[PDB]
Amino acid sequence: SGFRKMAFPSGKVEGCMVQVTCGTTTLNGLWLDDVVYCPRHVICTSEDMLNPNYEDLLIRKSNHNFLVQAGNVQLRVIGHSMQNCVLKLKVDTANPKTPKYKFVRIQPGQTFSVLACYNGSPSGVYQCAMRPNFTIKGSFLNGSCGSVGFNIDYDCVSFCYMHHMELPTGVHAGTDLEGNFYGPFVDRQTAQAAGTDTTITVNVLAWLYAAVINGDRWFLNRFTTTLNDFNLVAMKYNYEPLTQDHVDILGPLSAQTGIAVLDMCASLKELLQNGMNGRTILGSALLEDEFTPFDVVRQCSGVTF
Amino acid sequence: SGFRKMAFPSGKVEGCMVQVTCGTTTLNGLWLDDVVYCPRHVICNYEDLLIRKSNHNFLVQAGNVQLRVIGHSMQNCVLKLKVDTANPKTPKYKFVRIQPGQTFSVLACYNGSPSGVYQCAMRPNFTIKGSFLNGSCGSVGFNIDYDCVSFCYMHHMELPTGVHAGTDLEGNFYGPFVDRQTAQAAGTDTTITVNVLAWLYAAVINGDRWFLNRFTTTLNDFNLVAMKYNYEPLTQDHVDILGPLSAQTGIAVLDMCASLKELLQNGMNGRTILGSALLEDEFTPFDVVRQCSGVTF
Numbered sequence: 340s341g342f343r344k345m346a347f348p349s350g351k352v353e354g355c356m357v358q359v360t361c362g363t364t365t366l367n368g369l370w371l372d373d374v375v376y377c378p379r380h381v382i383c384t385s386e387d388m389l390n391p392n393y394e395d396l397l398i399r400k401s402n403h404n405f406l407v408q409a410g411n412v413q414l415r416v417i418g419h420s421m422q423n424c425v426l427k428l429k430v431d432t433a434n435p436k437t438p439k440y441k442f443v444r445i446q447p448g449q450t451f452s453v454l455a456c457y458n459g460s461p462s463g464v465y466q467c468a469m470r471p472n473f474t475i476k477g478s479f480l481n482g483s484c485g486s487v488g489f490n491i492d493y494d495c496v497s498f499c500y501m502h503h504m505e506l507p508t509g510v511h512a513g514t515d516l517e518g519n520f521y522g523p524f525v526d527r528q529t530a531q532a533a534g535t536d537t538t539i540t541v542n543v544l545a546w547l548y549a550a551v552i553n554g555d556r557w558f559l560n561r562f563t564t565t566l567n568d569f570n571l572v573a574m575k576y577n578y579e580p581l582t583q584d585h586v587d588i589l590g591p592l593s594a595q596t597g598i599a600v601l602d603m604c605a606s607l608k609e610l611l612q613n614g615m616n617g618r619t620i621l622g623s624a625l626l627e628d629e630f631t632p633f634d635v636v637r638q639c640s641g642v643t644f
Numbered sequence: 645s646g647f648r649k650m651a652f653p654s655g656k657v658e659g660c661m662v663q664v665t666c667g668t669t670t671l672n673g674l675w676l677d678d679v680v681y682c683p684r685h686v687i688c689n690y691e692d693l694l695i696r697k698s699n700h701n702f703l704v705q706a707g708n709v710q711l712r713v714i715g716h717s718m719q720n721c722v723l724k725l726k727v728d729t730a731n732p733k734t735p736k737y738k739f740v741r742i743q744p745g746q747t748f749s750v751l752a753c754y755n756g757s758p759s760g761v762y763q764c765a766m767r768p769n770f771t772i773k774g775s776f777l778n779g780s781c782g783s784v785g786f787n788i789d790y791d792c793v794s795f796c797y798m799h800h801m802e803l804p805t806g807v808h809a810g811t812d813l814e815g816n817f818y819g820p821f822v823d824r825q826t827a828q829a830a831g832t833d834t835t836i837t838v839n840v841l842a843w844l845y846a847a848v849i850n851g852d853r854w855f856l857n858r859f860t861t862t863l864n865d866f867n868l869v870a871m872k873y874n875y876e877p878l879t880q881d882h883v884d885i886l887g888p889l890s891a892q893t894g895i896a897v898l899d900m901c902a903s904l905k906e907l908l909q910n911g912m913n914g915r916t917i918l919g920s921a922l923l924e925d926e927f928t929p930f931d932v933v934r935q936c937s938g939v940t941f
């Protein structure tokens with residue numbers, strides 16, 4: 340029993356964290372085999388950030404301008420190349436601690452663990468989700484750029500995020516490990532603002548099924564709804580539209596608890612209308628949207644209480 | 645910016661997790677040097693049950709390697725299995741006993757394999773609100789101070805309300821619990837006042853000031869009010885401990901106590917603090933300072 344926001348064990352990722360220095364800028368890099376991946380803005384000054392021409396800044400650099408430090412050991416840079424918004428530093432030593440890994444690009448609503456690092460040293464691990472507006476609500480201070488997001492289903496680490504910047508509202512933006520930004524963001528100090536955020540409906544539904552599995556049913560009702568009527572109501576509370584894919588994805592949790600997806604939708608509609616009335620669901624007074632259907636199946640027991 | 649429930653990086657602890665099997669029971673063990681520590685209920689008068697076991701009855705597995713048990717002894721509610729191989733991944737460590745209100749990271753394991761890491765606090769009623777399933781026994785709680793791992797908790801059991809109970813690494817239970825199937829219940833819990841205050845300072849640091857007011861209270865008047873909402877008493881030590889956060893924000897501890905009093909008697913009025921509609925008590929003053937400064941390990 341119990342339901343916590345749980346992160347993946349961070350060991351396989353800790354053994355890949357390095358410090359990258361270029362001039363006066365110091366940030367984090369990910370050392371996999373003989374390559375160190377880091378945000379390309381490490382080559383910029385704060386002045387450059389308004390309208391940087393990365394190709395022009397990079398051509399002026401030599402391998403010995405990039406200082407890479409793995410623990411107390413200096414790695415020698417033997418090559419460099421840019422791929423989208425990520426700099427790839429070829430080093431003379433392969434990381435002996437390189438785990439089995441893949442680079443995966445995630446979709447909004449997907450969750451992942453973040454290993455927050457400063458000066459190539461890990462300080463903490465937390466769980467978070469890619470918001471529908473392509474930002475993440477993280478906990479990052481200056482020097483955290485280059486920190487990575489990942490999942491470790493089975494023994495393979497799936498890297499899905501690298502931290503690049505903080506937006507004026509305090510939310511965070513970054514790229515996949517191929518350097519493509521999530522959202523319409525640029526690694527430029529331009530007027531950039533996160534779009535209006537919405538609640539991840541399929542995740543709230545999954546968390547309501549997790550509550551039923553852990554023994555709580557106070558929020559259920561005798562009503563059902565059509566998918567269209569549910570979406571007309573949900574959009575009014577800034578909830579993401581629920582698609583037939585989401586309904587299909589919630590199938591296993593529906594069969595385990597005996598509550599049809601559109602019946603759980605009717606209960607969600609009622610929660611939005613009435614609030615919680617001094618009650619909590621899984622120790623929370625708000626409807627939680629940072630647990631996917633896959634996370635619920637992984638954390639909860641297979642026997643409904 | 646940002647304020648998340650953050651756990652310590654778990655790598656140094658992952659390299660110590662092993663699987664311990666005795667008869668039909670399989671649970672987790674902590675392998676430090678040539679000793680494997682695990683709940684003594686794996687042998688299930690524990691000395692009478694233990695005397696009947698031989699070294700070869702305990703099957704210990706570290707990854708895909710079988711460790712040979714060469715000795716065994718009991719210390720309170722923990723079994724210590726002497727093995728023939730020292731763990732090459734043993735980190736710098738200490739066994740520390742924590743106090744209620746203190747927080748720690750839990751590396752949840754099943755079959756000697758780590759599956760997740762989360763942060764939690766020792767409740768005033770000595771239980772923890774964790775997330776564990778069958779097979780999680782032997783999972784450990786820890787803090788990291790510089791490069792040294794301080795092991796503070798080993799999981800033993802789940803109580804009827806879904807909360808968890810366990811021991812320090814010397815086998816002494818936290819709380820009035822015993823390791824056996826009997827009628828045991830967690831006592832009435834209370835809110836960790838010094839932690840709620842620390843989290844209110846974290847909100848001010850992150851730009852949330854709607855709850856601040858011009859008022860201040862005495863420590864005695866604050867405790868008379870707090871006792872009525874099942875909040876732990878606030879001591880002069882707690883006030884002293886909150887000193888650094890008070891100096892950083894410019895809000896005196898008794899000034900923040902007056903804001904907490906208004907929140908208890910009036911609620912949040914449809915508002916949130918750090919994305920929460922409840923007053924959060926699982927961040928210590930040290931956790932707030934560490935996360936709002938970036939200390940590394």
Ligand SMILES: O=C(Cc1cccc(Cl)c1)Nc1cncc2ncccc12
Pocket residue numbers: 380388479480481482483484503504505525526527528645
């Ligand atoms: O935002 C930046 C650097 C930057 C500036 C302009 C554009 C780009 Cl792509 C990157 N660094 C930070 C990251 N996360 C969190 C922070 N918190 C405070 C200060 C700085 C932080």
Ligand SMILES: [Cl-]
Pocket residue numbers: 444445446449
């Ligand atoms: Cl995805």
